[model samples]
Target: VSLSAIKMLLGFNESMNDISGYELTWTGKGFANALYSEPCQKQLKLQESFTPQTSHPNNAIIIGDNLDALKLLKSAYSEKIKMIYIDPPYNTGNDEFIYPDNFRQDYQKILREVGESLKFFKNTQGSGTHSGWLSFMLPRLKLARDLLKEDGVIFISIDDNECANLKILCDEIFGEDNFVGDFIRKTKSTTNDAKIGLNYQHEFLLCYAKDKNYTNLLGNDPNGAWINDNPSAKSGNMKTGYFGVTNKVDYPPVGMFWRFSQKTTQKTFDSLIFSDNCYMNQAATKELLNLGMGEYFTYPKGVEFMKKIILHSTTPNEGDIILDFFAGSGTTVHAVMELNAEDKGNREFILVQIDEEIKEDESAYDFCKKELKSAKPVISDITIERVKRAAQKISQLSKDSGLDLGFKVYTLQDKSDLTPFDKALNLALQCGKTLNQALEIIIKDKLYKCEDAYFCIVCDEEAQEYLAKSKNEMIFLDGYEEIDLEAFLNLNASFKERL
Candidate 1:
């Protein structure tokens, strides 16, 4: 709890046994709050082989549990993201979402007790309850909230399964004042829920803003004709003038005046009526099929749909960063790249996908083994492959050399035994440094520099040598087993024990 919240609670009457207030609560709510507050002890390890070199590389993909990834990103990306779109697990009864909530014990302790082999508990069958789903989302949502810019917005795709629960949950996390709108999009023309005697053909896109007053969701140009015009004016600005080119006349004949100014009338004539918010889901399937990846994933989001939301929310040339932590098959990145190619924009993306293992029965499993040459196939492999294919397709089709068509890949791993350089890089990231800025070092392997600060990750002898030679502010990595902490402190250099 914040100091303000504690003070507010204290402001209540001390004699009263209970002071009532409205709040969303469930099993493990306290634990979920605690989980979001816990510091992420993990660091990102760059996958050199998976990263493609480019002149203006500005995007990245992280393969890990999104909860951990979001926590790790909070320090660096706080208030830096322009938009976020996620399609999290819908918590349908049959869906085996891997999140287990233990109301009675600490979750980290439970993770250790269950053995490292089972990193996460699969919430399947009877365990797919509403409370369990809320518990799973609470921490992740809280962490994601910290990463949005002041004018940022988040769009979540969900079906009827848990939309109401999610609505209330979002109201609490983002505040009811920031709720934008819940858009409905047609998922299919036909209904598979015919057994229930209704054609359920749509899902929802719930949107919210970091600060509602700062947000401006652009609308499509209106398409319909401007019809009604009051002949009589109410009061001031009763000056009459010629309206259109062909039918030019003294606008309001004699006694009455024109309701709108000629300029306003011309503006209305030039504008088109805005279209409805509805979109079809079939385009998403067709997109995947065209990319030859239709069979690997199910119900992937359409590029056009994502494009519409991103285009509406973000500016074209601002280099806005779009994030999708629940990146399935990498649709968001593909859409961003395609949009940039078409509009000559410089928007970037950051995607995160968990390396969830693919079932042997799934076609993606064999495709990964035979085509991608992966011995152990996971969902992230598919994500990486699809992104590569999408970038290639965009480059071939557009032939635009100026576009940024590359992204680096990083995997979340334990901080133990990280190389000195990796530790320095991680520290730079935690200090809110960009990857490009961190990579631009004064010395390749021994010394790093970012924005008025120097990082020394060399041996003790070399470190002393640099310390004696250089007068700039320096940060030293505590990669050594034992170090003279007081000596370093006296030298006025910052020392980090962990990345």
Candidate 2:
């Protein structure tokens, strides 16, 4: 059934109308949501064993607000992600979703009773209502769409709370045609958490493509690699080729001319390219189209459902990148490592998680206080720990597979608070910088996995001699205040260009 027809059957209100050519308009949706109004100058900070030592396509685990993280990755990863899977907060009034929330207890309970809370109110405007949820989600999805390859796809795990609103918002952002169907996942057995005698059993995964024009590079057919080459010419080209299709006289589709030139068709031997099915590869087909949980598809759960969701959409081969900006618990990277181990593919993952503080009474807080002596827990710590444990588990199972269990960790540090420096010299120096930032300042680019790079400050004691043994390396030399230019050139004039 059509969307409008389904809405009619459900008796949805007419307020869902969109005269602006399909958009979900709400308060606070006008402005851009960015960590910085200007282009983000965010840099990556790494810890000891997590150094960028190998040139392997090491997985990246970034800790910061995903908004800034996405912006920072834009320069390096734009249009390069094959799949993105996010399980964002459902905005069920209690998600602490960074939005103002002061809803009445009775009203909130009523909405929850019917499972209509976020669907009906996620973006609604009032003194303490839904627009904040919409505003928070709007730009993140936009940035994610920007990072997706033409044949890329995104799968969002949402409950009914914001699923309806999110669907409409995505229709506007990603274009309606690119929307793949929403598949239901039975996360748990039916529970009597609602007051309306209704049991909640399922959540949804909303899927979309970056663009639907590219032919899919999946499923090796009988005829080697497949490309959508046309057999007949269109009207825009010279219309002389009304050639026979081998022994058959086949006409072009309505309102189109033959695909080949008359001269070429007459001279060449017949080679027909027949395809039974032609699909826009960007369309996502769920691996299991089960409406309800079956024995084979699920025990109604997975150890790594997000990982399965990512792998099913695209084949990760070579240096293909799979990203998850909402990488809660670092499950995405674990899945990538396990999948790579299983298939011996060199796939990489970029994971982003915000360092949200734990609650006072939560177990995370208790663990932090008792074990680490911190009053509050940081979400990034948990994420990093999970990845380490998962990597260790995978390493134990397949030590001979050459699995790259080591991931370069890059925590997102807030922009430094420094007085304005000199435009010429200080911009070069980036004063009061961290060790990594100092390296970034000298290199003047984001670090990548393609090079063996490291740094040592000359001002630090014995740092020069320590680094002197390092030859033919991308080394960052900091605080080399009194180095003789002649000696520097003589040491390494192999490829020095006069700056």
Q: Name the lDDT value of residue 158 in candidate 2.
A: 84
Cα lDDT of model 1 by residue, 193-251, tens digit: 69978987778888889999999776246766554334543234545432522565444
User: Which candidate wins on TM-score?
Assistant: 1
Worst 10 residues of 1 by lDDT: 267-276
Q: Estimate each model's TM-score.
A: 0.76, 0.60
Q: Tens digit of lDDT per residue, candidate 2, span 249-366?
A: 7765433456666533222111111111111111111211221112111111233454456455666455667788776666567677766665556677778887778777665566
